[PDB]
Amino acid sequence: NFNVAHGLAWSYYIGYLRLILPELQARIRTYNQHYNNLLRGAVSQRLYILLPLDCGVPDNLSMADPNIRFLDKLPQQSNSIYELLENGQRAGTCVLEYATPLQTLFAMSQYSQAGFSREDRLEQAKLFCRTLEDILADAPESQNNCRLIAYQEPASFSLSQEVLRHLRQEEKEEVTV
Amino acid sequence: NFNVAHGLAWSYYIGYLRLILPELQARIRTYNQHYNNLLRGAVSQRLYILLPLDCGVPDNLSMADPNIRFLDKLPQQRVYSNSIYELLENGQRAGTCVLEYATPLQTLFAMSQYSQAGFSREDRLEQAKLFCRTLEDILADAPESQNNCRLIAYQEPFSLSQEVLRHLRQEEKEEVTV
Ligand SMILES: Nc1nc2c(ncn2[C@@H]2O[C@@H]3COP(=O)(O)O[C@H]4[C@@H](O)[C@H](n5cnc6c(=O)[nH]c(N)nc65)O[C@@H]4COP(=O)(O)O[C@H]3[C@H]2O)c(=O)[nH]1
Numbered sequence: 001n002f003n004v005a006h007g008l009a010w011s012y013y014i015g016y017l018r019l020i021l022p023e024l025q026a027r028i029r030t031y032n033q034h035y036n037n038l039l040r041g042a043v044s045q046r047l048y049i050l051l052p053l054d055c056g057v058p059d060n061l062s063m064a065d066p067n068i069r070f071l072d073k074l075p076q077q078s079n080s081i082y083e084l085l086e087n088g089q090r091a092g093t094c095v096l097e098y099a100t101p102l103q104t105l106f107a108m109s110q111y112s113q114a115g116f117s118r119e120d121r122l123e124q125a126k127l128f129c130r131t132l133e134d135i136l137a138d139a140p141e142s143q144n145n146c147r148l149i150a151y152q153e154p155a156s157f158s159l160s161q162e163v164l165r166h167l168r169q170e171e172k173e174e175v176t177v
Numbered sequence: 178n179f180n181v182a183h184g185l186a187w188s189y190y191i192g193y194l195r196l197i198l199p200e201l202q203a204r205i206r207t208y209n210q211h212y213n214n215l216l217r218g219a220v221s222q223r224l225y226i227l228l229p230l231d232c233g234v235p236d237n238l239s240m241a242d243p244n245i246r247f248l249d250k251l252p253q254q255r256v257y258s259n260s261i262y263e264l265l266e267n268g269q270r271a272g273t274c275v276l277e278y279a280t281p282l283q284t285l286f287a288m289s290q291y292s293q294a295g296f297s298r299e300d301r302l303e304q305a306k307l308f309c310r311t312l313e314d315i316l317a318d319a320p321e322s323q324n325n326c327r328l329i330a331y332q333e334p335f336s337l338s339q340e341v342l343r344h345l346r347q348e349e350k351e352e353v354t355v
């Protein structure tokens with residue numbers, strides 16, 4: 001009984017993703033048309049959503065990994081395009097952001113009146129990802145312009161490598177079928 | 178056993194109410210100085226939160242009742258938008274307060290119209306009441322809550338102005354009574 005993640009996932013979809021995802025692919029499409037000659041290649045058309053299961057969302061992506069560098073702004077019709085580095089070389093680019101409702105789960109774990117433990121938090125974080133994936137599976141503003149990147153960090157970790165893996169898998173899918 | 182309302186209430190508290198509420202009474206007092214000098218008025222001290230159980234949230238308060246009349250923006254001191262309204266009886270100023278709908282009810286209503294949710298009007302109403310109860314429970318133990326906010330939950334069959342005025346008057350009674 002009592003899972004905050006249910007409502008967090010539904011509200012993130014209804015009050016956010018549903019609104020920005022269609023036309024997100026249109027600002028990336030437009031961007032690619034306009035700027036492909038400056039851009040060595042293209043930006044993935046999907047929004048990449050980081051879901052760290054520890055619920056740790058920093059104010060700047062590069063703080064989590066120096067191999068993730070801000071590249072440019074996606075013009076409106078806030079979203080930033082990031083470059084992913086391997087040995088100082090650009091290995092990929094994409095629109096990246098953390099799933100904001102994970103900050104609620106973290107804030108709750110530090111709020112004592114909630115009776116919400118770090119153990120509860122991890123469990124609700126996983127539940128958030130599961131519920132959100134289910135929602136996006138049947139949504140018209142499809143999964144197809146959105147990808148969930150859920151990861152549990154150990155106790156060294158490369159977030160950029162984690163993202164690069166999804167990018168490379170996505171391109172494989174695109175060209176195989 | 179699903180219960181979207183649990184997350185919505187915790188989310189509304191954590192990501193909004195606990196942020197806005199600590200500074201609320203100072204922003205109101207500051208405004209009250211000028212409101213009192215200029216018009217001999219006084220804005221109540223608590224954030225009034227409308228929780229219609231039908232989850233109907235207009236983009237303009239007056240549309241739900243023309244006796245609820247927008248007066249001003251409450252000045253800052255993040256960037257939070259709060260509106261001060263005058264409440265009217267027979268064209269006369271009966272009261273004044275910071276007033277707004279609980280935004281997460283819009284999520285409940287949007288879900289209602291989203292067929293893939295399998296979320297009916299019956300679920301929506303049940304979840305709206307749970308949202309109210311859950312939010313109440315949270316605010317009971319919340320430090321940012323003095324109380325410096327008041328929940329106005331109501332099922333409709335109507336005067337919203339009269340519903341709110343009734344709370345404003347009950348609040349003033351308590352203030353001068355104890
Ligand atoms: N990256 C990103 N994520 C976004 C954005 N907008 C919404 N989200 C995400 O979606 C969650 C739910 O948004 P909601 O439906 O508007 O639900 C909101 C809303 O109902 C209410 N709320 C938040 N801010 C305000 C406000 O300034 N005024 C009022 N009246 N309500 C607010 O509190 C609920 C909880 O807010 P959150 O904790 O912030 O949780 C947000 C946030 O995690 C965005 O522009 N960028």
Ligand SMILES: [Ca+2]
Nearest residue numbers: 174175176177
């Ligand atoms: Ca092919």
Ligand SMILES: [Ca+2]
Nearest residue numbers: 229231233333
């Ligand atoms: Ca109504």
